[PDB]
Structures are given as structure tokens and as C-alpha cells.
């Protein structure tokens, strides 16, 4: 029937294109009085809206007056609620003041807003925060409607989530601040995530106070709900670049994108419930003097174009098509993803560093660490799928494993792992207090100067611009001439572990393998430091290990547990880690690793990096405070 699209937004869009929208939107001959109109509220005052409503009601009892604006205002929401309670008309809130979610709505009111509710916003922001492993949050509410329900939902989400969440004191902004009783509260806030549940002007004032009192840093990530960013044409300058704005709509989902959907839902409800009420457009005569089978609460189940646009008891889209965007550098909303009805469809899974949020931020303390798959080091595992999250002890590693060889798609799953390097980076970030970007990319193995072929994590850390790497490998020639390793925290060197009568590597059975010790599988892992060391020391032994090259570390362990592998030459730490879990203590380390190579594990740093001194001091403090025995007892668990 008649679709009164009262667009009260400030933009003067051509309303002539709205009359011809009946064709593609279910053009049926059942509605007779299809009086499609469109107005443009210029003056932003309740009086103009009241006059427009009273004029439209006199126009042959116009029913179903869909209203929408461009800026969310608390006055327009209350006015539309009063209109829907008095006139009892199924209004459809599209955007602006028509979509301002309130705390407690009227039961008889048919205010059907489009977008996400406060609980849905809390859920999606909790998902976004847990996808980046951010548990230190600070909730700040205000006097606007929707604070008690919001804090209740937050407390409920924290209770069921058993992965740890720093619940700091909630700051209330119900009263006006005078910079005498709120600065002390804002100073105590030390969490990274800053939940700012306020309005536009209040958020601007909070950002101004943070910039004037020295609260804006490279670690404070402000998050605002859809109430703050309720528009796509006005962006203040106080908000820095990187403000996560979870808005229910953007420039893609403009007014015209929802007008057609609302008209389709309305005409579908009319065609469905027309057999009950013949005269559907029955409203009051005018504004002077003036639910059984109407169309008031019978349009909360129309599924338009497959979208789950069902309304709740108060009226709100249960599964909206909200788009989560952030703030770019040139005062524009840069899209990073959206949220589907099933789960969170985060397009930009890699969170940017954002070393400079605002213009006056010269501090750059964002680093990056690269790690690979190693047997003696942290074992690569998967994230716990019982809650799609993990714990703080398991640092989420950004994996890069592909599905197939011919395919180019790389799964950037946020899997968490625990181990030696994980604890190293944890204690480093706890003592040195720096930010890192850890990622586990599928690479090769240890690279060296063989035909200038650099692969694996070694090839990555050889070049500059790389901060550091948790992988502390054996000391070599090229890996020490290219980059400057830190102090070796361990003294384990290269030795041999035969799976009794031998004297290590000084036995005469290696120089002449013809009579004694016939040539067997004596090779090490392909492209390893031991190969280079032997080639530099013994050419014939290197040729023998090359012509008898074995498989990886796991196959070497399987062969050692079987008995076919004679000897396994590697670092003493790896040999001790392997012997710590022997299946009967069969293989024994013949000679420790201090008479053959006497190497160590040095952190792969950058040549001429300012963080080298800090890493060296951190290592000397960690191995110079009396916890070396504790580390040896915790990591090395050799019982045999």
C-alpha cells in the first residue's frame, strides 16, 4: 500500500527515484491505495516532525510511515517512540535518530530499528578483542540509555569466558567532568583496551583530555560502539587513526539500500495479513481530538532476500549486516571486515601495528618476530577449539600454512603455542616491556653461504629491517659475520650420541671407515649447521654424511628408537631433550658437547640494532639472578 518514506536526513537526495521502487520490490496488484510519498525534513526540531506527521495523517489516513535520518539523536528516538506508542503505526528505523537503541522500550510501541542491539555489539567487540588476545580492558559508561544493560552483559560474558579477562574498575561519566575529579580516575587506567561507551561529543572530550594530559600512547587501543560512529559523513579530528568503530551501517549500506528492503518487508506483511484486516490503512483523522488483526506485531518474521531481519520483543534486527571498519590516516573509515550471522567474518585478520595513531606520535616501539617449526624448540600446535580461544601462557602465533601446493590461499589462523621460545618471548615482553608481532610462516631450513642461497628463518634474519627472532640456533661463521647474535644463554655444543666403546669424534674409526665402522647412515638434517661445520673441519666426513643423508628429526628419532640408526650428531641440548623421553633409555650420549664444537644458542638480532643492548641486558639478568637452576629443572626433565 502507501509507503511514506519520510527521509529526514540532512543530505538533499533526489526523492523522485523512490516512487518507481514499487516495481522491483514485489509489484503486486493486491494493494490498491499505493500512495508512495517522500519528504525532506530540513529544520532539525521536533516541531517540524510533529507538523509533518500531522499533515501525513490527514492524507487519507497514511499508514506505515517509515522514518530515517543521518545522525543519531536521542530526541528523535524518543519522538518516534512516542509516535509509535500513540498512533500505533509500524515505523521502521533505518538510520540516524530512528536507529538510536534505548534501554527499555514500550511494549505497545512498534519501533522497529535496523542494526545490532547492545548485546550484539558487546558480543562482536568481545570476539574482536579475543581474536587479538586483548584481555586488559577498561569499561567507561555514561548517562545515556544503555549502560546498566551493557555492564550486565559485559559481566555475564566475563563469567562464562574462563580464559582470563582483566576486569578493571568501571569509570562512570553520568555527571559533567571539571578536570578535577575525573583526571585521577583516568590516570589510574593502565589497560590497553579502552571501552568508551559514550556519545560523539563525550568521546571527543575524552580524546581531547587524553591528548592534553598525556594518556594517548602507542598501546592504547580505543574502541567505540555504533552509538559513537552513527554517521558516515562527519568525522572529528580528535579521534586518532586506528579507532575501531563497530557501526551497524556504512556508506555501502546507505538509506536507499534499506528503503527497498523495508518496502519489501512491508508489502510482504500486507499481502500475508491482508485476509484478516481488509482496510489496513486505518489511522487517525488529524491531530485535533484524535491491535486485534492489524499489521503492528505481524511483520517480525518476514525474511527479505534471505536476510534474518526478524525483530525481538522491542524490535531490532537479530542478524544485521553490520560492517566493522577502522579510522584511516586521511580522516576516512577504512573497511577491515564485517560480521555474518553465523560467526565473525574478519576480513583483515592481521591487525596493523599503527605505530603512529595521531600526528604527534614519534614513538615507534612495534617489533616483529619470526619463528619456524623445530623439534627441540617450541612444538607447533593448534588453538583450543572448545572456546575458539586460548590462554595467556600460549602466545597466539600467526600461522601461514596453505591448504594445497598448487593453491595460493594462505590460512592465517590464530593458533597459540607453548614452549621454550614462547616463554622466552613472554619474559622478554614482561621485563623489557616491548610490543612484538609474532608469526609462524612455513619456510625452509637453516640457510648458509652455499651458492648464496638463504632460506628459512635464517635467510629472513640475515637481511636487515628484521627486529629479532626467538629461534636461538647454534653459533656459526656466516650467521655471526652477517648479524650480531646476543650472549649465548646455553653452553651446549655439537656432540655425537651413538644409539659405548667409542670415544666421541676422536675415535680412529671415523678416519678409516674401511676396516672398522663401515659406512652407514651418518648424515644430519639437510642444510644444517653441523654440515657446514664438518665441511669446514672434515671434508671426507661431510661427503660421507652427504651420500648418507637421512630424513628429518622425527624420522631420526624413530630410527633411534628402532635401532637402525647408528649415531646421531647434533647439539648437546637437542640430544638431552631427546634422551629425556627415551623409551627405555637405550641410546646414551657418549661424551658431552664441550670438546668438539662448544657452541651456544644466540638470539638472531639485527646488525647494528638499538635493541641488541636491551636483549643482552635482559639475558644477563635472566641468567644472572639465581633462576638458572629453576629453568634447568623446569625445561630439562631427564629422568634416565
Amino acid at each position, epitope marked *: 500500500l502507501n509507503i511514506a518514506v519520510l527521509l529526514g536526513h540532512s543530505h538533499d537526495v533526489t526523492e523522485r527515484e523512490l516512487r518507481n521502487l514499487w516495481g522491483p520490490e514485489q509489484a503486486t496488484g493486491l494493494p490498491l491505495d499505493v500512495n508512495v510519498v517522500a519528504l525532506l525534513m530540513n529544520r532539525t526540531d521536533p516541531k517540524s516532525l510533529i507538523t509533518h506527521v500531522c499533515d501525513l495523517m490527514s492524507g487519507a489516513r497514511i499508514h506505515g510511515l517509515v522514518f530515517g535520518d543521518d545522525t543519531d539523536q536521542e530526541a528523535v528516538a524518543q519522538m518516534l517512540d512516542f509516535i509509535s506508542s500513540q498512533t500505533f503505526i509500524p515505523i521502521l528505523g533505518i538510520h540516524g535518530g530512528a536507529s538510536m537503541i534505548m534501554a527499555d522500550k514500550d511494549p505497545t510501541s512498534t519501533f522497529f530499528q535496523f542494526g545490532a542491539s547492545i548485546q550484539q555489539q558487546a558480543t562482536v567487540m568481545l570476539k574482536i578483542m579475543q581474536d587479538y588476545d586483548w584481555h586488559v580492558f577498561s569499561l567507561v559508561t555514561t548517562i545515556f540509555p544503555g549502560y546498566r544493560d551493557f555492564i550486565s552483559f559485559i559481566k555475564t560474558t566475563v563469567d562464562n569466558s574462563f580464559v582470563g579477562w582483566d576486569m578493571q574498575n568501571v569509570i562512570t561519566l553520568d555527571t559533567s567532568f571539571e578536570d578535577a575529579k575525573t583526571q585521577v580516575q583516568l590516570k589510574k587506567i593502565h589497560s590497553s583496551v579502552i571501552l568508551l561507551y559514550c556519545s560523539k561529543d563525550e568521546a571527543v572530550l575524552i580524546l581531547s583530555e587524553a591528548r592534553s594530559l598525556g594518556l594517548t600512547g602507542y598501546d592504547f587501543f580505543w574502541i567505540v560502539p555504533s552509538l559513537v560512529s552513527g554517521n558516515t559523513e562527519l568525522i572529528p579530528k580528535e579521534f586518532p587513526s586506528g579507532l575501531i568503530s563497530v557501526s551497524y551501517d556504512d556508506w555501502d549500506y546507505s538509506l536507499e539500500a534499506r528503503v527497498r528492503d523495508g518496502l519489501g518487508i512491508l508489502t510482504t506483511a500486507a499481502s500475508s495479513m491482508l485476509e484478516k484486516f481488509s482496510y489496513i490503512p486505518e489511522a487517525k483523522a488529524s491531530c485535533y481530538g484524535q491491535p486485534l488483526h492489524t499489521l503492528h506485531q505481524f511483520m517480525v518474521n518476514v525474511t527479505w532476500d534471505g536476510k534474518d531481519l526478524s525483530f525481538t520483543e522491542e524490535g531490532y534486527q537479530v542478524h544485521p549486516r553490520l560492517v566493522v571498519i577502522v579510522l584511516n*590516516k*586521511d580522516r576516512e573509515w577504512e573497511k577491515v571486515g564485517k560480521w555474518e550471522n553465523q560467526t565473525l567474518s574478519l*576480513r*583483515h585478520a*592481521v591487525w*596493523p*601495528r599503527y605505530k603512529s595513531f595521531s600526528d604527534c606520535e614519534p614513538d615507534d616501539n612495534h617489533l*616483529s618476530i619470526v619463528t619456524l617449526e623445530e623439534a627441540p624448540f617450541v612444538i607447533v600446535e593448534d588453538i583450543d577449539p572448545l572456546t575458539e580461544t586460548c590462554v595467556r601462557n600460549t602466545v597466539p602465533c*600467526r600461522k*601461514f600454512v*596453505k591448504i594445497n601446493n598448487s593453491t*595460493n*590461499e*594462505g590460512m*592465517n589462523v590464530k593458533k597459540c603455542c607453548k614452549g621454550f621460545c614462547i616463554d622466552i618471548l613472554k619474559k622478554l615482553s614482561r621485563t623489557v616491556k616491548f610490543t612484538y*608481532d609474532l*608469526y609462524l*610462516v*612455513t619456510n625452509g631450513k637453516h640457510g648458509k*653461504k652455499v*651458492n*648464496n642461497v*638463504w*632460506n628459512g628463518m635464517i*635467510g629472513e634474519v640475515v*637481511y*636487515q*629491517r628484521a627486529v629479532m627472532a626467538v629461534g636461538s640456533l647454534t653459533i656459526n661463521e656466516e650467521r655471526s659475520e*652477517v648479524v650480531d647474535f646476543s650472549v649465548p644463554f646455553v653452553e651446549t655444543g655439537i656432540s655425537v650420541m651413538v644409539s659405548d666403546q667409542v670415544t666421541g669424534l676422536s675415535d680412529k674409526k671415523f678416519q678409516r671407515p674401511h676396516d672398522y665402522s663401515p659406512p652407514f647412515r651418518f648424515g644430519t638434517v639437510p642444510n644444517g649447521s653441523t654440515e657446514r661445520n664438518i665441511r669446514n673441519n672434515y671434508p671426507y666426513m661431510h661427503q660421507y654424511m652427504t651420500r648418507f643423508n637421512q630424513r628429518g628429526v622425527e624420522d631420526a628419532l624413530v630410527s633411534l628408537k628402532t635401532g637402525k640408526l647408528d649415531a646421531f650428531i647434533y647439539d648437546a641440548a637437542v640430544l638431552n631433550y631427546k634422551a629425556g623421553r627415551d623409551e627405555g633409555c637405550k641410546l646414551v650420549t657418549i661424551g658431552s658437547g664441550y670438546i668438539f664444537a662448544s657452541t651456544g644458542y644466540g638470539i638472531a638480532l639485527q646488525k647494528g640494532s638499538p635493541w641488541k643492548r636491551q636483549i643482552d641486558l635482559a639475558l644477563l639478568q635472566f641468567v644472572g639472578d639465581g633462576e638458572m637452576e629453576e629453568l634447568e629443572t623446569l625445561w630439562l626433565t631427564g629422568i634416565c
Partner: antibody, heavy 118, light 108 residues
Framework: QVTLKESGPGILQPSQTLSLTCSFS??????????VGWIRQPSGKGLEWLAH???????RYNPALKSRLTISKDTSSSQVFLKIASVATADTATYYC??????????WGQGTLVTVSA | DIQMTQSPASLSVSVGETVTITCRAS??????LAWYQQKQGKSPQLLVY???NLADGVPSRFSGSGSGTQYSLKINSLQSEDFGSYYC?????????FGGGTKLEIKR
């Protein structure tokens, strides 16, 4: 096979933002290796390296141009859109997006003409 | 940044003579240097990468050697298909500065 194509506004006024686009097909940008990197060469001078993005979607700009150089890519449409604001007559160069990998040979594209003038 | 001081472009070598592109280096000593060749209007094609191996479609006369700060590009047989400006771009440090440009011509 590996194909490259450079597009963008040929004539544009200075002190604005370009609309460079490095379209390609056959490969990707987050496929454990081959990526993309912007390279420009002014008239009468050598080439210049501004910035590039790796496979793990990491950004790293140039210290001398750390005011407007913002590199961005997309894995859904396989496009590389570069945003450079506050341009002038000195930035007039033929931008290239070639390979920056340690493979056998880096592949190069034709290139587009970008004449910045009022 | 690594100051790359390539040989001047006024280096004319006749057909048959050897070419020694003397692209010097700076205080920052590196080990890998990728040579390129930019023709008239075409794109710079990588000839020798890391100064140790050849690329696909590169003749065998283009040989690279040198260590420390002195890196040269030995050209055994100079032919007509070797026309174009040569650059010594290094991927070792963070600033990937290019060379001055080696313009080879016939001095007859």
C-alpha cells in the same frame, strides 16, 4: 602465466591523492613468497624504492617519505592500490610493481604513465 | 643508507672488448648484489642476482664476481643485444637504493 598490468590517472593535479592500481593474474600476494612492490623512476634520474609489502601483510614505509606513503593490497580482487597524498611535480615518475623475491628471475610489468601537473 | 656509486654513464666499449662495470659500495659492506639492465623504454631485466647465479633468459657471458665493497660485472662477449642502462640494486639493507646507470656505446 605471470602477467602484470599498471593502471592509474595519467594527468592529475599536484597536492592530491593518486589512484594507482597494479592489476595482475596467475599468482597472489599472500602465497608464501611472491608479493608486490612499488618502484618509480623519474625522468632523467635513476629508480627509487619507496615501500613494499610481504606475504604476511606487513607494511614498512620509507623514512624520508613517512608522511603520506601508505601501501595497501587486497587478496579478494588481487589488486594493489597505492595511496600517495601531497604529491608535486617531483613525484612525476613511471611507477612499476615487479617481483621482490629470491626466486630465479623477478618478473616486471609494462607500467603506466603518471604525469602530475596542474 | 648504503651509498651506491656506480660507474659513470660515459663508458663506451666497442664490440669484442670486455666490460667492467665498476659499481663501488659504501661503509656498509654487503654480500648480495642483483644486477639489472634497463633498455630504451623497456623494464629493467635482472641479469645476475646475488652476483653468483644466472637468471632465465640471460646469456652466459654476463658473469658477476667481487666481494667486500668492489663488485664488477664481467661481460665476456659484448653483442648488440646488450644495449641499455645497467644498475646495481642491492637487497641487503633496508634502503634499496639504485645505481647511477651504465650506458654502453660504441666508440667509433
Amino acid at each position: 602465466q605471470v602477467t602484470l598490468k599498471e593502471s592509474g590517472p595519467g594527468i592529475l593535479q599536484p597536492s592530491q591523492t593518486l589512484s594507482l592500481t597494479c592489476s595482475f593474474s596467475g599468482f597472489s600476494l599472500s602465497s608464501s613468497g611472491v608479493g608486490v612492490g612499488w618502484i618509480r623512476q623519474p625522468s632523467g634520474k635513476g629508480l627509487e624504492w619507496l615501500a613494499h609489502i610481504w606475504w604476511d601483510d606487513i607494511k614498512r614505509y620509507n623514512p624520508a617519505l613517512k608522511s603520506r606513503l601508505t601501501i595497501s593490497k587486497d587478496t579478494s580482487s588481487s589488486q594493489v592500490f597505492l595511496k600517495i597524498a601531497s604529491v608535486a611535480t617531483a613525484d612525476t615518475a613511471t611507477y612499476y610493481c615487479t617481483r621482490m623475491e629470491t626466486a630465479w628471475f623477478p618478473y616486471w610489468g609494462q607500467g603506466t604513465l603518471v604525469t602530475v601537473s596542474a | 643508507d648504503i651509498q651506491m656509486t656506480q660507474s659513470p654513464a660515459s663508458l663506451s666499449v666497442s664490440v669484442g672488448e670486455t666490460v667492467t662495470i665498476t659499481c663501488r659500495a659504501s661503509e656498509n659492506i654487503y654480500s648480495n648484489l642483483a644486477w639489472y639492465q634497463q633498455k630504451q623504454g623497456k623494464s629493467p631485466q635482472l641479469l645476475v642476482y646475488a652476483t653468483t647465479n644466472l637468471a632465465d633468459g640471460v646469456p652466459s657471458r654476463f658473469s658477476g664476481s667481487g666481494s667486500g665493497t668492489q663488485y664488477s660485472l664481467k661481460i665476456n662477449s659484448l653483442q648488440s643485444e646488450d644495449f641499455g642502462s645497467y644498475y646495481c640494486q642491492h637487497f641487503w639493507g633496508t634502503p634499496w637504493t639504485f645505481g647511477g646507470g651504465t650506458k654502453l656505446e660504441i666508440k667509433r
